[PDB]
Structures are given as C-alpha cells and as structure tokens.
C-alpha cells in the first residue's frame, strides 16, 4: 500500500460551480445551471481560505476564477474538480457515489410533502388520519410543539419530512402505542422502495410530555436503506482494512462496510477534534477514515446564508493545519464535497455542481492540477491504494499522486 492511511474529508455541499447537467436539476422551479457555491460566496461576502489555497483550491479549473482565492504558483498538493454521474443531488447519492456506486434511481425528496398515495396508504393501514398541515418540511422539534396537543386529543398521525429523503412519524406514547408506531413505520418502509416514493430513511419519533413542553424518547427506531451494491468501504472491510467513520457517514451508509464508527458530530469543530483524535489512535496503523462535516449544508446552504457559509469555510480553513500536523508522512489527505448548496440561489435545496478535490501528503514529490474527473474516482483511488477491487464505477488517480 502506497499510502498507509487515507483520510477523506467531505465538506458537505461545498460546490465549485454548476455541472454540465445542472439544468436537469432545480430549486423552487429554477434550474440549477447558474449555481456556484464557492464562486458566489466569494464574490458576495468574500472568502479567505489561505490554507486550502496553498494546497491549491484556486488552481482548480473554472471558466471564471474564484474572486478572492488566488491561484498558487507553488502549491503543496494536487487539485481538481469532480463531476457527479448519479441521477441525484442528495446527500446519500453523493456519498454512495464517492464510494463507487452509480445511483440511477435517485431518492425522492418532498418539498411539498408526501403525495396522496403514500399518506392515503398509511392512513388506511394504521386506521389513523394524518395531520395534513404537518405533511411538509418541518423542524422535528417544532412540529411536535405545533401539533402535539392536537395529536394528544385526536390520535392523528404526525408525518413530516426534511430537506433529506426522510419520512418521520412523531407519535405521543400515551395515545399511540410504540408497537403500533413501529408497525406503521415498517409498513411505511415497505411502500417507499421505488420512485416516485423512494425514501432513504423512515424514522419513528416517539415522544412524551405535555403541551408547550415535549420530550423525544429513546424508543426511536430507524429503517434505512443500505447501499444496493458493495461499495469501496465493503471492499476494504472485507479485506481486513480498517474503516473509521466520523459524523453522518455511518448513518448515510447504514453502517455498511464500516468497522469503526466514531459517531455524530456536535458541530464541524467537534468533528475535526474527533478526526484528529482518530488519527492519533495507536490502533489506527493502517486503513481509511471518512469524515463528513455537515454544517456548511445544514446551517448555511439550506438557509441561504452566505455570510455564515463564508465564516464556516474560514473556520475549517483555520483548523486545516491541525489536521495536517496530525498526519503521518505516509498518510494521504483528501478533501471534497458531495454536491453544491449555493447560499445565493433561489430555492432552499442542494444545487447540482462539480465538487473540488484537494489532495495532500507530506510524502508528495510533486504538485499541481489533475485532469477533471468524476466523484467515484475517489473510491477507485482508495481501492487502488489498498489493493482491493473497485465497486461500480470510478477510475484511480493514484498514479498521479506518486
Ligand atoms: Mn450533502
Ligand atoms: Mn442538505
């Protein structure tokens, strides 16, 4: 194995400009072809990311340069941008492709709530009406505050969603028995396996308490889809190669091919702490770490907050030298994203964009820019490095790094 360890960090949603097929995707009816997460942030609120620029962020080919991220004539790493092949721009699709799958049946998202077929089906199975005013994207903690009292009186189901392909059912334990909530969720899981209702995850959300003061209970159950084919995580795990997960990674893959889940992040910074700790483990002598830093997407992209997005990027850039200081000489660091989420754009959804790829190792004997590639080339490079099979798609760029 050329690199003894590889650390892949996903800056969730950090796109670097509309993809060739961007107009096949949209935001509140507006096609994605004008989106440009990094570029639009830079030209509106500014963007100071000297540590990523030094690796070569400003060397990645673009029609027009990042306004405030200059090219670097003496870069320390290799950079390029990667194009998504899968027909979805959601988080699960992007990560699964980064690990080598080609998703041609993209998960459905429901900005206007679940269709009548799904709701009507669940209503008939459960014998309970669904509260239609709650069938829409909704803070899980606010929907319970808003319709909890009603549910306590009527026993109606509260079914809601998020920006993700997720269906959640909140049900007060006093009026809706756990056993029943689970059966309903299982039935729900069974009728959402194909488009136009393909759901990544069904979540039972039991809760207790009283009006204006509710508490979610540990009786939560999840019903998630695993990758439909072995990914490079499976290839590594099957070969006895360690796979460490940080952040949303375990959830996204439903644990498939993950030997060491380090758990959810409290925040990006707490995630970077956890990655640094993981890198320092005496047991972690060989293998792969896979970290998702989600704040860019959840707090800033979806909320169309460019100022905050900028700050979040700056704060990651400030911590990047800590990650690098913790690398062994024969470690490789890869930084990328899973789609865009342009905070200057119409809508409040992800945007179909190229994603940056930054590559760094102290053992590098060269630097510069790689040919533009595809998401799954990341998986193939990792597979190549550890001498395991590729999954569905992807081509290694390992030979360019050595
Ligand atoms: Mn994402
Ligand atoms: Mn998102």
Swiss-Prot record:
GO BP term (any one): metabolic compound salvage
InterPro entries reported for this sequence: Alkaline_phosphatase_core_sf (IPR017850), DeoB (IPR010045), Metalloenzyme (IPR006124), Phosphopentomutase_DeoB_cap_sf (IPR024052)
Record-level GO cellular component terms: cytosol
Named cofactor requirement(s): Mn(2+)
Keywords: Cytoplasm, Isomerase, Manganese, Metal-binding
Cited SUPFAM superfamilies: Alkaline phosphatase-like, DeoB insert domain-like
Cofactor: how and how many bound: Binds 2 manganese ions.
Pathway: Carbohydrate degradation; 2-deoxy-D-ribose 1-phosphate degradation; D-glyceraldehyde 3-phosphate and acetaldehyde from 2-deoxy-alpha-D-ribose 1-phosphate: step 1/2
Function per UniProt: Isomerase that catalyzes the conversion of deoxy-ribose 1-phosphate (dRib-1-P) and ribose 1-phosphate (Rib-1-P) to deoxy-ribose 5-phosphate (dRib-5-P) and ribose 5-phosphate (Rib-5-P), respectively.
Record's protein name: Phosphopentomutase
């Amino acid at each position: 194995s050329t690199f003894n360890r590889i650390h892949l960090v996903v800056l969730d949603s950090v796109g670097i400009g509309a993809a060739p097929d961007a107009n096949n995707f949209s935001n509140a009816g507006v096609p994605d072809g004008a989106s440009d997460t990094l570029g639009h942030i830079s030209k509106t609120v500014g963007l100071n990311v000297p540590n990523m620029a030094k690796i070569g962020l400003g060397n990645i080919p673009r029609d027009t340069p990042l306004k405030t991220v200059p090219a670097e004539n003496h870069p320390t790493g290799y950079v390029t941008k990667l194009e998504e092949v899968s027909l979805g721009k959601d988080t699960m699709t992007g990560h699964w492709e980064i690990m080598g799958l080609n998703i041609t049946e993209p998960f459905d998202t429901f900005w206007n709530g679940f269709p009548e077929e799904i709701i009507s089906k669940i209503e008939k199975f459960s014998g309970r009406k669904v509260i239609r005013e709650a069938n829409k994207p909704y803070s899980g903690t606010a929907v319970i505050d808003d319709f909890g009292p009603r549910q306590m009186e009527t026993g109606e189901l509260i079914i809601y969603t998020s920006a993700d392909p997720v269906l959640q059912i909140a049900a007060h334990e006093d009026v809706i028995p756990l056993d029943e909530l689970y059966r309903i969720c299982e039935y729900a899981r069974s009728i959402t396996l194909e488009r136009p209702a393909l759901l990544g995850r069904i979540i039972a959300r039991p809760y207790v308490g009283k009006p204006r003061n509710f508490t979610r209970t540990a009786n939560r159950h999840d019903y998630a889809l695993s990758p439909f084919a072995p990914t490079v995580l499976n290839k590594l795990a099957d070969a006895g190669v360690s796979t460490y997960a940080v952040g949303k990674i375990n959830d996204i893959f439903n644990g498939s091919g993950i030997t060491n889940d380090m758990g959810h992040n409290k925040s990006n910074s707490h995630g970077v702490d956890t990655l640094i700790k993981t890198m320092g483990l005496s047991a972690f002598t060989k293998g792969f770490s896979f970290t998702n830093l989600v704040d860019f997407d959840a707090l800033y992209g979806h909320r169309r907050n460019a100022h905050g997005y900028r700050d979040c990027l700056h704060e990651f850039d400030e911590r990047l030298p800590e990650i690098i200081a913790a690398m062994k000489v024969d470690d490789l660091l890869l930084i990328t994203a899973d789609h865009g989420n342009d905070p200057t754009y119409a809508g409040t959804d992800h945007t179909r964009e190229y994603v940056p790829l930054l590559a760094y190792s102290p053992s590098f004997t060269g630097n510069g820019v790689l040919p533009v590639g595809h998401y799954a080339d990341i998986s193939a490079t990792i597979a190549d490095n550890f001498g395991v099979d590729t999954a569905m798609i992807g081509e290694s760029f390992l030979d360019k790094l050595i």
